[PDB]
Enzyme design. Structure first.
Site, PDB file in Angstrom:
ATOM      1  N   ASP A   8       1.286  -0.873  -0.059  1.00 35.52           N
ATOM      2  CA  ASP A   8      -0.698   0.305   0.307  1.00 35.52           C
ATOM      3  C   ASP A   8       0.757   1.203  -0.044  1.00 35.52           C
ATOM      4  OD1 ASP A   8      -2.882   1.881   0.105  1.00 35.52           O
ATOM      5  OD2 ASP A   8      -2.144   1.671   1.768  1.00 35.52           O
ATOM      6  N   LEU A   9       0.977   2.142  -0.741  1.00 38.37           N
ATOM      7  CA  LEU A   9       0.879   3.589  -0.725  1.00 38.37           C
ATOM      8  C   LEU A   9       1.388   4.454   0.514  1.00 38.37           C
ATOM      9  CD1 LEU A   9       3.554   5.418  -2.597  1.00 38.37           C
ATOM     10  CD2 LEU A   9       1.520   6.163  -3.382  1.00 38.37           C
ATOM     11  N   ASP A  10      -0.116   4.742   0.982  1.00 37.83           N
ATOM     12  CA  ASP A  10      -0.770   5.649   1.775  1.00 37.83           C
ATOM     13  C   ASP A  10      -0.895   5.502   3.292  1.00 37.83           C
ATOM     14  OD1 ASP A  10      -1.425   8.556   3.370  1.00 37.83           O
ATOM     15  OD2 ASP A  10      -3.447   7.367   3.239  1.00 37.83           O
ATOM     16  N   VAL A  47     -12.614   7.604   0.577  1.00 44.42           N
ATOM     17  CA  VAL A  47     -14.052   8.015  -0.226  1.00 44.42           C
ATOM     18  C   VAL A  47     -14.003   8.822  -1.659  1.00 44.42           C
ATOM     19  CG1 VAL A  47     -16.534   8.482   0.402  1.00 44.42           C
ATOM     20  CG2 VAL A  47     -15.189   8.233   1.740  1.00 44.42           C
ATOM     21  N   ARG A  49     -14.973  11.776  -4.503  1.00 42.08           N
ATOM     22  CA  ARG A  49     -14.850  13.659  -4.611  1.00 42.08           C
ATOM     23  C   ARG A  49     -16.453  13.643  -4.208  1.00 42.08           C
ATOM     24  NH1 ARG A  49     -11.513  15.682 -10.070  1.00 42.08           N
ATOM     25  NH2 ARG A  49     -10.450  13.925 -10.756  1.00 42.08           N
ATOM     26  N   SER A 114      -1.415   0.532  -4.022  1.00 41.28           N
ATOM     27  CA  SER A 114      -2.209   1.458  -3.653  1.00 41.28           C
ATOM     28  C   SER A 114      -3.495   1.864  -4.794  1.00 41.28           C
ATOM     29  CB  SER A 114      -1.448   2.698  -3.689  1.00 41.28           C
ATOM     30  OG  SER A 114      -2.203   4.001  -3.503  1.00 41.28           O
ATOM     31  N   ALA A 115      -4.906   2.158  -4.344  1.00 41.29           N
ATOM     32  CA  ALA A 115      -5.830   3.636  -4.423  1.00 41.29           C
ATOM     33  C   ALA A 115      -5.637   3.702  -5.766  1.00 41.29           C
ATOM     34  CB  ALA A 115      -6.423   3.863  -3.375  1.00 41.29           C
ATOM     35  N   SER A 116      -3.768   4.911  -4.727  1.00 40.44           N
ATOM     36  CA  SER A 116      -4.093   5.891  -5.618  1.00 40.44           C
ATOM     37  C   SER A 116      -3.680   6.325  -7.286  1.00 40.44           C
ATOM     38  CB  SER A 116      -2.010   6.554  -5.049  1.00 40.44           C
ATOM     39  OG  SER A 116      -1.452   7.287  -5.641  1.00 40.44           O
ATOM     40  N   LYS A 117      -4.457   7.131  -7.657  1.00 37.77           N
ATOM     41  CA  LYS A 117      -3.936   7.732  -9.289  1.00 37.77           C
ATOM     42  C   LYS A 117      -2.738   8.137  -9.402  1.00 37.77           C
ATOM     43  CE  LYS A 117      -5.008   6.251 -12.115  1.00 37.77           C
ATOM     44  NZ  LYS A 117      -5.735   6.942 -13.620  1.00 37.77           N
ATOM     45  N   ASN A 118      -1.845   8.667  -8.237  1.00 38.44           N
ATOM     46  CA  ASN A 118      -0.802   8.945  -8.353  1.00 38.44           C
ATOM     47  C   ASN A 118       0.319   8.429  -8.476  1.00 38.44           C
ATOM     48  OD1 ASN A 118      -1.838  12.211  -9.323  1.00 38.44           O
ATOM     49  ND2 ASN A 118      -2.899  11.922  -7.489  1.00 38.44           N
ATOM     50  N   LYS A 145     -11.075  -1.372  -2.547  1.00 41.56           N
ATOM     51  CA  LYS A 145     -10.928  -2.116  -1.660  1.00 41.56           C
ATOM     52  C   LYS A 145     -12.453  -1.362  -1.007  1.00 41.56           C
ATOM     53  CE  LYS A 145      -6.100  -1.001  -2.123  1.00 41.56           C
ATOM     54  NZ  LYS A 145      -4.391  -0.424  -0.985  1.00 41.56           N
ATOM     55  N   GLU A 169      -0.149  -3.022   5.482  1.00 45.30           N
ATOM     56  CA  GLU A 169      -2.004  -1.899   4.650  1.00 45.30           C
ATOM     57  C   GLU A 169      -1.834  -1.354   6.414  1.00 45.30           C
ATOM     58  OE1 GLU A 169      -3.270  -0.489   3.277  1.00 45.30           O
ATOM     59  OE2 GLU A 169      -4.131  -1.821   1.399  1.00 45.30           O
ATOM     60  N   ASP A 170      -3.010  -0.551   5.831  1.00 44.88           N
ATOM     61  CA  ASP A 170      -3.302   0.672   7.172  1.00 44.88           C
ATOM     62  C   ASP A 170      -4.406   0.463   7.858  1.00 44.88           C
ATOM     63  OD1 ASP A 170      -2.917   2.390   4.744  1.00 44.88           O
ATOM     64  OD2 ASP A 170      -3.104   3.838   6.613  1.00 44.88           O
TER      65      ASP A 170
HETATM   66 MG   LIG Z   1      -3.386   2.933   3.438  1.00 39.74          MG
END
Ligand SMILES: [Mg+2]
Length: 218
Positions: A8-10, A47, A49, A114-118, A145, A169-170
């Site tokens: 995971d990233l974040d 969540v 935008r 990760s979910a991240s688009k960046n 997720k 994961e976090d």
């Molecule tokens: Mg996370």
């Protein structure tokens, strides 16, 4: 022995949630809406935008057009992207760089889930791209997720099954997504948040290769 780790990233590798919070806080202000703080932000966290904006707009009974709701959602995104331009290698969480190196040297595959688009951008900027064999593209995965889809893609992209892997994961949604892929989760945080049926470290310092190895054998 596990053949990959899926990151995971974040909240594991780095903090992207700080910059998100400020983008939503900034938008709240530039509109005139009151009290978008970090406690409130826990309603905006995992969540989309649309719902985030809906919740921010409900803090003062503010009604918006449509060709304006679209704009306001786009301003937050434009602003987040401004703000993450200053992500540096200095923002890599403790023990992550060293874990990645030990993994590259033991020939264990490294993939992002990760979910991240960046995601790739953030890895370039932190100087971690060299270590990752693949990056799961969350636009290509049908579901997010707690679904296991992004962890499956992450493993497949490096040529392994989830069951040959450990997921880092976090978040509870993240843990449940690792679990349903067939991977072995190792949490970062509180078992109050993540669950006492899995292995959790307090912070990312404790994510070592040696620890990761001990967990697999257990
Ligand atoms: Mg996370």
């Amino acid at each position: 022995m596990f053949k990959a780790v899926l990151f995971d990233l974040d909240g594991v590798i780095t903090d992207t949630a700080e910059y998100h919070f400020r983008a939503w806080k900034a938008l709240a202000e530039e509109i005139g809406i009151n009290g978008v703080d970090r406690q409130f932000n826990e309603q905006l966290k995992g969540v989309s935008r649309e719902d985030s904006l809906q919740k921010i707009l409900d803090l003062a009974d503010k009604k918006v057009s449509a060709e304006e709701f679209k704009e306001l959602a786009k301003r937050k995104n434009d602003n987040y992207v401004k703000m993450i331009q200053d992500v540096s290698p200095a923002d890599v969480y403790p023990g992550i760089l060293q874990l990645l190196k030990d993994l590259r040297s033991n020939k264990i595959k490294i993939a992002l889930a990760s979910a991240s688009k960046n995601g790739p951008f953030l890895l370039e900027r932190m100087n971690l791209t060299g270590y990752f064999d693949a990056i799961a593209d969350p636009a290509e995965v049908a579901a997010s997720k707690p679904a296991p889809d992004i962890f499956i893609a992450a493993a497949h992209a490096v040529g392994v099954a989830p069951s040959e892997s450990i997921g880092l994961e976090d978040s509870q949604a993240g843990i449940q997504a690792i679990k349903d892929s067939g991977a072995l989760p190792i949490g970062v945080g509180r078992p109050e948040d993540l669950g006492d049926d899995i292995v959790i470290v307090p912070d990312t310092s404790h994510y070592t290769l040696e620890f990761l190895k001990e967990v697999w054998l257990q």
